[PDB]
Coordinates of C-alpha atoms in Angstrom, one line a residue:
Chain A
X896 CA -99.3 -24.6 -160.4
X897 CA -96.1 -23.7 -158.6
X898 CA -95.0 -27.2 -159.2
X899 CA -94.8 -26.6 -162.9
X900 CA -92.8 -23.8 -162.6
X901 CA -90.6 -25.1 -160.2
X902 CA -89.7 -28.4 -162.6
X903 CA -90.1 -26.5 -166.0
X904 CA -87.8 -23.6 -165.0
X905 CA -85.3 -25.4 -163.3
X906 CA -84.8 -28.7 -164.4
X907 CA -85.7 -27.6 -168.4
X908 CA -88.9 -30.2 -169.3
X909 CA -90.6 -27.4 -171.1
X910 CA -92.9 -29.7 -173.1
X911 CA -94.4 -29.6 -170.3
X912 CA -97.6 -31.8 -169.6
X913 CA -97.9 -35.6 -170.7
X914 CA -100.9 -37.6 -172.4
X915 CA -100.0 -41.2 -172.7
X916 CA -101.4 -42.6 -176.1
X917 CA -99.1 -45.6 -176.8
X918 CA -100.5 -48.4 -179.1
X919 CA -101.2 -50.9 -176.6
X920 CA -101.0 -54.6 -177.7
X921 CA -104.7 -56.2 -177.7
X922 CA -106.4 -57.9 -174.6
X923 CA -105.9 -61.5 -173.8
X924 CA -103.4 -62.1 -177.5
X925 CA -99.8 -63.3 -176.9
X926 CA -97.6 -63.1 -180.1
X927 CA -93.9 -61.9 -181.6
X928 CA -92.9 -59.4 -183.2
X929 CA -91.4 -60.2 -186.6
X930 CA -90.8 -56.9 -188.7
X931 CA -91.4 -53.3 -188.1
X932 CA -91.7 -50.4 -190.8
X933 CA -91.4 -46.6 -190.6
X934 CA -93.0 -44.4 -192.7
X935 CA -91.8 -40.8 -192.8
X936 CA -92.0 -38.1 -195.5
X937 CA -89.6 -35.1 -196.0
X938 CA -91.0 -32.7 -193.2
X939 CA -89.1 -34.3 -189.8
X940 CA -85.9 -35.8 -189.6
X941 CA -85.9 -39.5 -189.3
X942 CA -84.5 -40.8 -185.7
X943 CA -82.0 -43.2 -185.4
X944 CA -84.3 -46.6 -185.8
X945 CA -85.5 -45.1 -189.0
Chain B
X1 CA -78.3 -22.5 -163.8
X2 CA -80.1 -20.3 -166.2
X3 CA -80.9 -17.5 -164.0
X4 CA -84.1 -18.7 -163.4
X5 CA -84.1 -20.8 -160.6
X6 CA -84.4 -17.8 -158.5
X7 CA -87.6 -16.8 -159.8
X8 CA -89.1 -20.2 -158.7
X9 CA -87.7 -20.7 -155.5
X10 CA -88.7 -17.3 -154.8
X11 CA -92.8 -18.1 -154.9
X12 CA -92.8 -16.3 -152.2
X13 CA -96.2 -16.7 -150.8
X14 CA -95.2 -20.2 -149.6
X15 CA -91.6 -21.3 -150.8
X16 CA -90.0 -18.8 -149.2
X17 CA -91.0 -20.6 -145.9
X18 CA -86.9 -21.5 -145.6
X19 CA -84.3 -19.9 -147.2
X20 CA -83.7 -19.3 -150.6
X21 CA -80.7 -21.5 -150.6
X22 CA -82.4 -23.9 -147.9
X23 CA -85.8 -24.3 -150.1
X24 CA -83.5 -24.7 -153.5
X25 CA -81.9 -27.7 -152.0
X26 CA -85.0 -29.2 -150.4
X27 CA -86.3 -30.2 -154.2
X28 CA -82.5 -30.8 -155.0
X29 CA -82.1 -33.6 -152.5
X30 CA -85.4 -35.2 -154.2
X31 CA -84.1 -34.4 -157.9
X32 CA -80.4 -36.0 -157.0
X33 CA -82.5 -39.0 -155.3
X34 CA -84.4 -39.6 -158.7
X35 CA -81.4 -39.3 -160.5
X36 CA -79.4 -41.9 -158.4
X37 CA -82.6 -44.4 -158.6
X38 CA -82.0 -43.6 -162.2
X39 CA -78.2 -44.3 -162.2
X40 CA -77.0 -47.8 -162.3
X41 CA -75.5 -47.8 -158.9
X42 CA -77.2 -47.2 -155.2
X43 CA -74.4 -44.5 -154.5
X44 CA -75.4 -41.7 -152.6
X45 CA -75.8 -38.8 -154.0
X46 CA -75.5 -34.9 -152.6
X47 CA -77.0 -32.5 -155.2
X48 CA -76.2 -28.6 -154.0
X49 CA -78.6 -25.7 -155.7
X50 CA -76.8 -22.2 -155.5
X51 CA -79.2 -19.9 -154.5
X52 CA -77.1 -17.1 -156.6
X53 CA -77.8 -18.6 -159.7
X54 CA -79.6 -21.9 -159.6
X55 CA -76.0 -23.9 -160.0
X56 CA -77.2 -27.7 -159.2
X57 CA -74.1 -29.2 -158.7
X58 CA -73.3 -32.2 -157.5
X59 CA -70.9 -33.6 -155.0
X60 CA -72.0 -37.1 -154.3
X61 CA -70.8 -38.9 -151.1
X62 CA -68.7 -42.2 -150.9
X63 CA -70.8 -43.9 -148.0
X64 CA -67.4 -45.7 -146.8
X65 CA -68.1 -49.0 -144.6
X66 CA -65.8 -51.4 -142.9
X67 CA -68.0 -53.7 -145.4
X68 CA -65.0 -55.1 -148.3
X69 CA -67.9 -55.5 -151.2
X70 CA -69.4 -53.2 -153.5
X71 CA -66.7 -50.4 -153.3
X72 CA -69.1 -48.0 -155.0
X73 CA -71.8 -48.5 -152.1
X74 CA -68.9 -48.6 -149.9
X75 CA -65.5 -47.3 -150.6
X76 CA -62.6 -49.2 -148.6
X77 CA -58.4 -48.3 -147.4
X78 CA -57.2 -51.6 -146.2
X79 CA -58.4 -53.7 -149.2
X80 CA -57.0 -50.6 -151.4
X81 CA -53.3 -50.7 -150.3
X82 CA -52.4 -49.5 -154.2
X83 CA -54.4 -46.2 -153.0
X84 CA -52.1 -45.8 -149.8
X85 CA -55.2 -45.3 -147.8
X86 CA -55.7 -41.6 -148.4
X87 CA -58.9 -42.1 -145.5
X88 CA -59.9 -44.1 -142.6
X89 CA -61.5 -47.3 -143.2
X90 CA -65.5 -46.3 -143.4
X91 CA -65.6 -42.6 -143.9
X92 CA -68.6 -41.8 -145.5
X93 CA -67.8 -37.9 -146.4
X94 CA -68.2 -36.7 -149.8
X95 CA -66.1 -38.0 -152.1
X96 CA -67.4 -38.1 -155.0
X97 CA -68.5 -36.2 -157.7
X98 CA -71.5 -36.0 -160.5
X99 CA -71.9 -33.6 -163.7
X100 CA -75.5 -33.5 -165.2
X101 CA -78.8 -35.2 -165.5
X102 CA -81.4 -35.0 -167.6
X103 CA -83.7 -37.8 -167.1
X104 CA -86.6 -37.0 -169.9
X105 CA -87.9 -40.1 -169.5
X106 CA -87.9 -40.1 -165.6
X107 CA -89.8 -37.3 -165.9
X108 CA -92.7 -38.8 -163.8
X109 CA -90.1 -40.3 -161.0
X110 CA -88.7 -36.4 -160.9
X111 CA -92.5 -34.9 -160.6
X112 CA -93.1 -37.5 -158.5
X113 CA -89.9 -36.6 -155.8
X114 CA -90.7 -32.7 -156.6
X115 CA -94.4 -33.9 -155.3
X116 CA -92.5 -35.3 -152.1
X117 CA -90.2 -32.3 -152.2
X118 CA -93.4 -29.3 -151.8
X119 CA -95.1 -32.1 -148.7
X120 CA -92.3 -31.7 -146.9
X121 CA -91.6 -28.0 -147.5
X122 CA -95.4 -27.4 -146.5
X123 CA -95.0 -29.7 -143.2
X124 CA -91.7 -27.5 -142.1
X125 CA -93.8 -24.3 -143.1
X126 CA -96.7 -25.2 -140.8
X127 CA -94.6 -26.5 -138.5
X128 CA -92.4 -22.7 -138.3
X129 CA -96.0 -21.4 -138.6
X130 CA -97.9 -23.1 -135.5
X131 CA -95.2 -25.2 -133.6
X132 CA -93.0 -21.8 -132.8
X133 CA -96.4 -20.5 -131.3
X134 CA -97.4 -23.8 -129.3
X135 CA -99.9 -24.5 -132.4
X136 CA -102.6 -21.9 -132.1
X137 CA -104.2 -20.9 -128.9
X138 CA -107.5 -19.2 -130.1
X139 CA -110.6 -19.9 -130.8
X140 CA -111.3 -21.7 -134.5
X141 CA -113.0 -23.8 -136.7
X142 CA -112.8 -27.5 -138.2
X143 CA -113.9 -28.8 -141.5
X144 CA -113.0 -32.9 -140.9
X145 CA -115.8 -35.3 -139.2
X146 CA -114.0 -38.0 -138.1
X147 CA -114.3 -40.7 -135.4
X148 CA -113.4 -39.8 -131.6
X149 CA -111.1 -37.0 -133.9
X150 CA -111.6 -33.8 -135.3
X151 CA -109.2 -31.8 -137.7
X152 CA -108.9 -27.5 -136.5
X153 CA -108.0 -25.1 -138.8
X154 CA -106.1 -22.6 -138.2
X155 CA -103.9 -19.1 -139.1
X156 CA -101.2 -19.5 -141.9
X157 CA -103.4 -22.7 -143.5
X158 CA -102.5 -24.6 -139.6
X159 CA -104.3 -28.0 -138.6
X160 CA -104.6 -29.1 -135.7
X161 CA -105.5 -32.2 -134.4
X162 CA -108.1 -32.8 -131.4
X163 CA -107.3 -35.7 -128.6
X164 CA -109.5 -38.1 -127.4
X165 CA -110.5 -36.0 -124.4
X166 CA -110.7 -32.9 -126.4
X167 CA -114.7 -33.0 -127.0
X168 CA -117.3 -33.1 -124.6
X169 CA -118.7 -36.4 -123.2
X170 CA -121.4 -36.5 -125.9
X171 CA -120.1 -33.6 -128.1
X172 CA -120.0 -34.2 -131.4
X173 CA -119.1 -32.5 -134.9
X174 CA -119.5 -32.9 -138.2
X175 CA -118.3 -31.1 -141.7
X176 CA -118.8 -27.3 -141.1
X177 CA -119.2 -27.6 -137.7
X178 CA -116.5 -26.4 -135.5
X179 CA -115.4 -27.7 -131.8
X180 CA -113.3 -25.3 -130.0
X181 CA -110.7 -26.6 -127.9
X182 CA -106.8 -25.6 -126.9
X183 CA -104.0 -26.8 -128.6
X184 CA -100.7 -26.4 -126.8
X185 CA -98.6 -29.9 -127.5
X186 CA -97.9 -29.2 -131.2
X187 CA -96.2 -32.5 -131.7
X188 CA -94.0 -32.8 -135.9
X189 CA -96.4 -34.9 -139.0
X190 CA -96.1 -35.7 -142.4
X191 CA -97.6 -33.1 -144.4
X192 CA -98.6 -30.2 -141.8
X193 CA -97.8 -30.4 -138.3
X194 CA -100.5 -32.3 -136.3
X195 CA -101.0 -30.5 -133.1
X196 CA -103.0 -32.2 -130.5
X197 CA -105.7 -30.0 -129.3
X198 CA -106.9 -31.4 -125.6
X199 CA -109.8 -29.2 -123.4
X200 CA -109.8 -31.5 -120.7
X201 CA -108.2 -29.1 -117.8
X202 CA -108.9 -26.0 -115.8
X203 CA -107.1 -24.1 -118.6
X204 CA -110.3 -24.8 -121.1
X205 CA -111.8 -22.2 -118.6
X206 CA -109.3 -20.5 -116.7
X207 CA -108.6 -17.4 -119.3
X208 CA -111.8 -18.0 -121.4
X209 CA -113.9 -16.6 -118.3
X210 CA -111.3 -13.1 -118.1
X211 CA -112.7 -11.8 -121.7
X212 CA -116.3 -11.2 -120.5
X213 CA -114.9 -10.7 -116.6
X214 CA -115.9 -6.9 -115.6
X215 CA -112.9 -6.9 -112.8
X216 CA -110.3 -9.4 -113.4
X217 CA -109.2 -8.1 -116.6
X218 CA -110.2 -4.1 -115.8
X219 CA -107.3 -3.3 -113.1
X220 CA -109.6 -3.9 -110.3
X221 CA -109.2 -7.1 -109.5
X222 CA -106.9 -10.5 -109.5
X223 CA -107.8 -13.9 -111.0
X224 CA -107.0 -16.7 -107.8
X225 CA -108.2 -20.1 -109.7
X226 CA -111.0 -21.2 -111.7
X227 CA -111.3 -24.9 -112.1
X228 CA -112.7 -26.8 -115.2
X229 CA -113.3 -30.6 -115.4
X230 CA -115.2 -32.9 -117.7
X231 CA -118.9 -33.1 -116.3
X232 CA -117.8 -33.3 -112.4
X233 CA -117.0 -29.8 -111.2
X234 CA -116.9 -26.5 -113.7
X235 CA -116.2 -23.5 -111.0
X236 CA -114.8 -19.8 -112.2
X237 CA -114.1 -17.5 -109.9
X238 CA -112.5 -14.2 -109.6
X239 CA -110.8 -12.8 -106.0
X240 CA -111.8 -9.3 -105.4
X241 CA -108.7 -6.8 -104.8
X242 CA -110.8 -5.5 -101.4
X243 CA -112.5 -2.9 -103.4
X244 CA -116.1 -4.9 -103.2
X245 CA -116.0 -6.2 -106.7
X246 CA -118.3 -8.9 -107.9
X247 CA -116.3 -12.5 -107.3
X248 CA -119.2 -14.6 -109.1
X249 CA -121.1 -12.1 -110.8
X250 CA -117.3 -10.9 -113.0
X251 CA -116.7 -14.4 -113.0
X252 CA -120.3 -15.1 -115.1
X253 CA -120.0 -11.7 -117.1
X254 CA -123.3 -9.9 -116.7
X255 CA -125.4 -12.0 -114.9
X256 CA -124.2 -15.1 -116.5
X257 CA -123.0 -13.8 -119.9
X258 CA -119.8 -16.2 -119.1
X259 CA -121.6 -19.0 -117.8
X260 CA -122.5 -20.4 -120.9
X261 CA -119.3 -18.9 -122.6
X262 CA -117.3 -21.9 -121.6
X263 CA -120.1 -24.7 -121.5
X264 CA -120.1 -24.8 -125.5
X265 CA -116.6 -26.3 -126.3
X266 CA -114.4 -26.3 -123.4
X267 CA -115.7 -29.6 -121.8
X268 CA -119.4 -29.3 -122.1
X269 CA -120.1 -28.2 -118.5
X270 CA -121.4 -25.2 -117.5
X271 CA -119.2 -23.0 -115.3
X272 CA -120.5 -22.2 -112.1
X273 CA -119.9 -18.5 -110.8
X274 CA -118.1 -19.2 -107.5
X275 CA -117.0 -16.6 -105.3
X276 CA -112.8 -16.2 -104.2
X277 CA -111.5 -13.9 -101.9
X278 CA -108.6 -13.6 -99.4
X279 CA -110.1 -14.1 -96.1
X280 CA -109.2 -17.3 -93.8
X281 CA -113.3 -18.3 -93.5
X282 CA -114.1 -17.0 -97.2
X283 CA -111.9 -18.8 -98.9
X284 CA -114.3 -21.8 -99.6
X285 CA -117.8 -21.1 -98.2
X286 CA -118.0 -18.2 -100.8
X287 CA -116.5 -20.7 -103.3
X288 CA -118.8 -23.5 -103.1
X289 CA -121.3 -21.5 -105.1
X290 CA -123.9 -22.8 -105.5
X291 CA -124.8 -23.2 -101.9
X292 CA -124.6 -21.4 -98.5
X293 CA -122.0 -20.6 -96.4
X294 CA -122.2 -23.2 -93.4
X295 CA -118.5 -24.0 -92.5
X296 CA -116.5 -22.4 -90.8
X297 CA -113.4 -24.4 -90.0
X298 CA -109.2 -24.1 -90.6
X299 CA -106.0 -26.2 -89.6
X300 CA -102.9 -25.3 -88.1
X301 CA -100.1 -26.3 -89.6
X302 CA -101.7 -27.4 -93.5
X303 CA -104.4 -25.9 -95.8
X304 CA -106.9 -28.3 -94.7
X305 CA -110.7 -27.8 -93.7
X306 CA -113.7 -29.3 -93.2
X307 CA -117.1 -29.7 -95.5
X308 CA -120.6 -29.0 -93.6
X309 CA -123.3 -27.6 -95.3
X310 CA -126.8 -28.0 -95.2
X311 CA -128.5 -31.4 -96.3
X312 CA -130.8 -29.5 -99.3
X313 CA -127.3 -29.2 -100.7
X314 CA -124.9 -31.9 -100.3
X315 CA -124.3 -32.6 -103.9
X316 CA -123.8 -28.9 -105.0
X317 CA -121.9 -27.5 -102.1
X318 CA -118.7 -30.7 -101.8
X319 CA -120.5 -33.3 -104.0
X320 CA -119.8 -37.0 -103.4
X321 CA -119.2 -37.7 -107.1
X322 CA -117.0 -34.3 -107.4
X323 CA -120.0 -32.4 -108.4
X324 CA -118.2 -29.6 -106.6
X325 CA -114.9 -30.6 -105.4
X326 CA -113.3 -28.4 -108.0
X327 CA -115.1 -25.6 -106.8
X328 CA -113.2 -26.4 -102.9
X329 CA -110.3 -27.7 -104.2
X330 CA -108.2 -25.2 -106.3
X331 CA -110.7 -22.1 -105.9
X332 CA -110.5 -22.3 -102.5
X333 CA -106.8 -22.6 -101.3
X334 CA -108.0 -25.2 -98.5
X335 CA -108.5 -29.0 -98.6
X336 CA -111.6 -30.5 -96.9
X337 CA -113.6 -33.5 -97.3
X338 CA -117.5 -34.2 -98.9
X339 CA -119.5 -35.6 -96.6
X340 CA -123.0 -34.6 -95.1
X341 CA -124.2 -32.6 -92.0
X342 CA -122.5 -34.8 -90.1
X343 CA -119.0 -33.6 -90.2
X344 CA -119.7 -30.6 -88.0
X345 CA -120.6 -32.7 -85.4
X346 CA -119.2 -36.3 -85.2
X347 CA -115.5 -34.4 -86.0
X348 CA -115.3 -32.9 -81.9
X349 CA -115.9 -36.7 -80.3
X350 CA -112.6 -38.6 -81.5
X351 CA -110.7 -36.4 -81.5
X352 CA -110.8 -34.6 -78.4
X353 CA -110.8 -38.3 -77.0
X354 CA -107.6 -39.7 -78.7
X355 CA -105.2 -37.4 -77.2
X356 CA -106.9 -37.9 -73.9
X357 CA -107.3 -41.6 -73.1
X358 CA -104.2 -42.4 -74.0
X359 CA -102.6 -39.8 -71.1
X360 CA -104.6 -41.1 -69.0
X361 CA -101.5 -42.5 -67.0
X362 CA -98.4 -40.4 -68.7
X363 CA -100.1 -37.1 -66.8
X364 CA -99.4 -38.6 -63.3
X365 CA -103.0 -38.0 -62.7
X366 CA -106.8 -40.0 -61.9
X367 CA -108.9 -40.7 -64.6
X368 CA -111.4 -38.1 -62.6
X369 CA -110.2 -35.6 -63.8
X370 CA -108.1 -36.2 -67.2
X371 CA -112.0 -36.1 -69.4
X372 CA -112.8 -33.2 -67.1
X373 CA -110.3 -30.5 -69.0
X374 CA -111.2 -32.1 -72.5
X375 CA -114.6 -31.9 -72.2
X376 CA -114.9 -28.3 -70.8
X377 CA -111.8 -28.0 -74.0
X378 CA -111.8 -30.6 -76.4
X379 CA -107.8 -30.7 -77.7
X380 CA -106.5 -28.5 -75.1
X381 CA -104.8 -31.9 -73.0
X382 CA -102.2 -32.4 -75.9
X383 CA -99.0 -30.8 -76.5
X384 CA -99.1 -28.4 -74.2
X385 CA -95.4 -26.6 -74.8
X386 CA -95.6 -25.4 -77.8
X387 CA -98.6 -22.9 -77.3
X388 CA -98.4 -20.0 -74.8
X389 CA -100.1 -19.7 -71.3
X390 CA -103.0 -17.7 -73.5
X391 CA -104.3 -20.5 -75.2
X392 CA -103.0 -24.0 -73.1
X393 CA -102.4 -22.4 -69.6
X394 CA -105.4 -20.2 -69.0
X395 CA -107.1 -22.3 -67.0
X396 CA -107.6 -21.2 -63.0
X397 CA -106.9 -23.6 -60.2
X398 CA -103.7 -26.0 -60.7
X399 CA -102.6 -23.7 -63.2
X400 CA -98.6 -24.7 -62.1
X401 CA -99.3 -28.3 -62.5
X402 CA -100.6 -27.7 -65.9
X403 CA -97.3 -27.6 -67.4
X404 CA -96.7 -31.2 -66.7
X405 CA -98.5 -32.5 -69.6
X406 CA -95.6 -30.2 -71.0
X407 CA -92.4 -31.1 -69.1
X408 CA -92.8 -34.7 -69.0
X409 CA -91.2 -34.9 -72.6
X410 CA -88.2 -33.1 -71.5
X411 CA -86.8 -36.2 -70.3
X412 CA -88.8 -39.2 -70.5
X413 CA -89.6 -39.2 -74.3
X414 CA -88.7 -42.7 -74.6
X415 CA -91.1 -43.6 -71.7
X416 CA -94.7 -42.6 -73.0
X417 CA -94.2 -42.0 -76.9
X418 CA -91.7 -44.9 -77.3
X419 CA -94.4 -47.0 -78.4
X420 CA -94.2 -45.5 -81.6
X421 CA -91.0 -47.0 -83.2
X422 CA -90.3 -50.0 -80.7
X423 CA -92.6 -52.6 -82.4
X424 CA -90.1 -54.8 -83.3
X425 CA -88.6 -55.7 -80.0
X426 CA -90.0 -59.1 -79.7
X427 CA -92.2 -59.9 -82.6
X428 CA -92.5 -58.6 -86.4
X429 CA -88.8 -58.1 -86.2
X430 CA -87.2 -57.4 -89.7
X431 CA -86.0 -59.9 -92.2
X432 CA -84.0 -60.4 -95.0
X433 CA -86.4 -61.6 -97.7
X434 CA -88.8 -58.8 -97.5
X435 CA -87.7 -55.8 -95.1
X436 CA -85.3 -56.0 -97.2
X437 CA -85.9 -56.7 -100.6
X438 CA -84.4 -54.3 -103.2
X439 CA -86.5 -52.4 -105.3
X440 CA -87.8 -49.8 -103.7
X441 CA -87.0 -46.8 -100.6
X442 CA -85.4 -46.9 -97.9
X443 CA -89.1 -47.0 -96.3
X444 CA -90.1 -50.5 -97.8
X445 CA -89.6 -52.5 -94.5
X446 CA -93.2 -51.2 -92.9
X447 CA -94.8 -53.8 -95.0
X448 CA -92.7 -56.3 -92.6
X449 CA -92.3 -55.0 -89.7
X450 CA -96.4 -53.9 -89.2
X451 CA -98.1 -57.1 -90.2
X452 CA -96.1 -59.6 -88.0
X453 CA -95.1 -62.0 -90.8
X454 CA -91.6 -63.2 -89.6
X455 CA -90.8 -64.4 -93.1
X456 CA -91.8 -64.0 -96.7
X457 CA -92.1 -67.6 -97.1
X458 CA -96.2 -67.1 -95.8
X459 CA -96.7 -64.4 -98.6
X460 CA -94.6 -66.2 -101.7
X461 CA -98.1 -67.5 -103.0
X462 CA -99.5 -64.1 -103.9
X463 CA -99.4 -62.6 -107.0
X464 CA -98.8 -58.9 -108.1
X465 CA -101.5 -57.2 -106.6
X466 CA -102.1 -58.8 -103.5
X467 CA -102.0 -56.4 -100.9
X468 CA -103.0 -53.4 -103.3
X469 CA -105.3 -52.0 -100.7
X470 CA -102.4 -51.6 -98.6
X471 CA -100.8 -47.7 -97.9
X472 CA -97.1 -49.3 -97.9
X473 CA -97.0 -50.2 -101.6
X474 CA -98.4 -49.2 -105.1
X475 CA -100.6 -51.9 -106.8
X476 CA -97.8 -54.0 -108.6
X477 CA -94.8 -52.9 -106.0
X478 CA -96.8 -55.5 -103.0
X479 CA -95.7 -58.4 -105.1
X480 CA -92.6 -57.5 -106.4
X481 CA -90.3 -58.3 -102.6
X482 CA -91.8 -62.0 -102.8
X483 CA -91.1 -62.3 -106.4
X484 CA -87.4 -61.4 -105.7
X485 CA -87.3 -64.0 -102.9
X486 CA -88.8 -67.0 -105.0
X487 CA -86.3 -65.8 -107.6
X488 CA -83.5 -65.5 -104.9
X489 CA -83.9 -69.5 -104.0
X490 CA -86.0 -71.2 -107.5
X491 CA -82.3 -70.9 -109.0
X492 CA -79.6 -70.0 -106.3
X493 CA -76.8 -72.6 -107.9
X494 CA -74.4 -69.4 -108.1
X495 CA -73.3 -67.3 -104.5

């Protein structure tokens, strides 16, 4: 569409599309968070959480 | 700025609808808006495109108020003494100045403004596209059923909208179906320009009728009126350049190949083939097709006539509903009234005995012979200077004493026709809560001074709409002179 090409060769997002697949938290459960662990082998750089 | 901003805004099947630089800052005011709704602060913000080059730069504005809080909604000079008050006090001119934005996770706020952006860009584009041209006068199509509306497309992707009075009485349309109709108020609308399509006037019909015409659009001969109304009165004619062309038969094509032309979508009626031409006596009895040529009647000083026709026809030649008034009102040039056979006889006994009884005495003659002249000439006893000695002094016998009637206005015109303007010598006089009551012409005072009401104390009861019926006043303008009196005296503490 000539919407993509006007964001993607103007503004730069050249990823371009988006598919939200977050983990979403399980219906009708309240809770905390108490640790978090990332798991990453040497192929990508780790961010900055990591 | 990449050298490719070009290549977008120049589509240029559709974006090219402004200019380059124009169409490049129509997403950049939406892309500068998402950016400030992602900045911390409401501050406006002015982002400029190049259209060389794609440069969005930005030069936000400082929205100065006289307001002293929130100096980056508001910038301020008094309060900012330390600055020597470069500015006035509240000038919101740009002032201010942003970098860069990348926004990857407003990403979906910037689609969303670029989405807002290409609506409004397609809006101006129709509205350039039909507006500029009145909509689009020509025959089309719609693809929306809707309720007591309808949705026309047009040329350059155009839609039109359709008024309440733009369909027939009971015309009706559905998806696929299309409903013809004119479109000349093209009103501004979000997303496309909304024109308002209306066939409700002689102009459904009026040029519709020349395409199949054999004469009117074939140098032969000129269109006078053609009149088009909703159900009532649908009369086309054509006025023959004296060269014996067809008046009703170009006006219905070929033998009625443009009567039903204009009964499909142009108000549902069927257009009548009347006749026009130039003559005094043609002008309307070949015009109130269809029926037969039975009056024969014109005024002197206005374009007024007379209706008489036979009584097989009285709806079709005048019509009492309007059935045909269009056909004698703007396809004939003269104005006369629907009635039945009755008119060509009843209209010679009143008036030829109004301007006689009344001179009865004013002529310095017996009552023998004042009915004698008007009954041998009905209206030849009246005004009696103005016309030669052809047509008011032909008469043998006293033919020197005829010019009395004449001559006895040269002097005396305050004896006979003073009656006229001296009704307020001794009763119905004028007054000073109604005569005159502001709110309306000089001419509001004949409400008071014909109805004998000394005061507006005897009317102060009525409404709004009380003396509607009357010729002096509209419907609401009766009541408004004793409204302004009650209000003159319910609270006149203050003089």
């Amino acid at each position: 569409t000539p919407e993509e090409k006007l964001l993607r060769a103007i503004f730069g997002e050249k990823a371009s599309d988006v598919k939200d697949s977050s983990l979403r938290v399980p219906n009708g459960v309240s809770g905390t968070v108490i640790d978090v662990q990332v798991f990453t082998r040497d192929g990508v750089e780790k961010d900055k959480r990591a | 700025m990449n050298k490719e901003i070009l290549a977008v805004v120049e589509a240029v099947s559709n974006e090219k609808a402004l200019p380059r630089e124009k169409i490049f800052e129509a997403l950049e005011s939406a892309l500068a808006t998402a950016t400030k709704k992602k900045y911390e602060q409401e501050i406006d913000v002015r982002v400029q495109i190049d259209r060389k080059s794609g440069d969005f730069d930005t030069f936000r504005r400082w929205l100065v108020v006289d307001e002293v809080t929130q100096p980056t909604k508001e910038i301020t000079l008094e309060a900012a003494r330390y600055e020597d008050e470069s500015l006035n006090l509240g000038d919101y001119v740009e002032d201010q100045i942003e970098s860069v934005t990348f926004d990857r996770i407003t990403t979906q706020t910037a689609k969303q403004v670029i989405v807002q952006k290409v609506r409004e860009a397609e809006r101006a584009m129709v509205v350039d596209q039909f507006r500029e041209h009145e909509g689009e006068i020509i025959t089309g199509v719609v693809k929306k059923v809707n309720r007591d509306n309808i949705s026309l497309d047009l040329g350059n992707n155009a839609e039109a909208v359709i008024l309440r009075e733009d369909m027939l009485p009971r015309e009706n349309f559905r998806p696929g179906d299309r409903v013809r109709g004119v479109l000349y108020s093209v009103r501004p609308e979000a997303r496309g320009a909304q024109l308002f399509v209306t066939r409700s006037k002689p102009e459904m019909l009026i040029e519709l009728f020349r395409i199949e015409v054999p004469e009117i659009g074939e140098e032969v001969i000129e269109i006078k009126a053609a009149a088009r109304d909703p159900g009532s009165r649908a009369k086309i004619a054509v006025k023959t350049n004296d060269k014996r062309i067809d008046p009703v038969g170009a006006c219905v094509g070929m033998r009625g190949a443009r009567v039903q032309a204009v009964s499909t979508e142009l108000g549902g009626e069927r257009i009548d083939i009347v006749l026009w031409d130039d003559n005094p006596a043609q002008f309307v009895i070949n015009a109130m097709a269809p029926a037969d040529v039975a009056s024969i009647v014109v005024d002197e000083d206005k374009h007024t006539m007379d209706i008489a026709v036979e009584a097989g026809n009285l709806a079709q030649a005048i019509g009492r509903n309007g059935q045909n008034v269009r056909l004698a009102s703007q396809l004939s040039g003269w104005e006369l009234n629907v009635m039945t056979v009755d008119d060509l006889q009843a209209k010679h006994q009143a008036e030829a005995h109004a301007a006689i009884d009344t001179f009865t005495k004013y002529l310095d003659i017996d009552e023998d012979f004042a009915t004698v002249l008007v009954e041998e000439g009905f209206s030849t006893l009246e005004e009696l200077a103005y016309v030669p000695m052809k047509e008011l002094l032909e008469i043998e016998g006293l033919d020197e004493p005829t010019v009395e009637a004449l001559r006895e206005r040269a002097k005396n015109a305050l004896a006979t026709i003073a009656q006229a303007q001296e009704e307020s010598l001794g009763d119905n006089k004028p007054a000073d809560d109604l005569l005159n009551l502001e709110g309306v012409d000089r001419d509001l005072a004949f409400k008071l001074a014909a109805r004998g009401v000394c005061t507006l104390e005897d009317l102060a009861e009525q409404g709004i709409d009380d003396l509607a019926d009357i010729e002096g006043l509209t419907d609401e303008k009766a009541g408004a002179l004793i409204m302004a009196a009650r209000n003159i005296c319910w609270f006149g503490d203050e003089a």
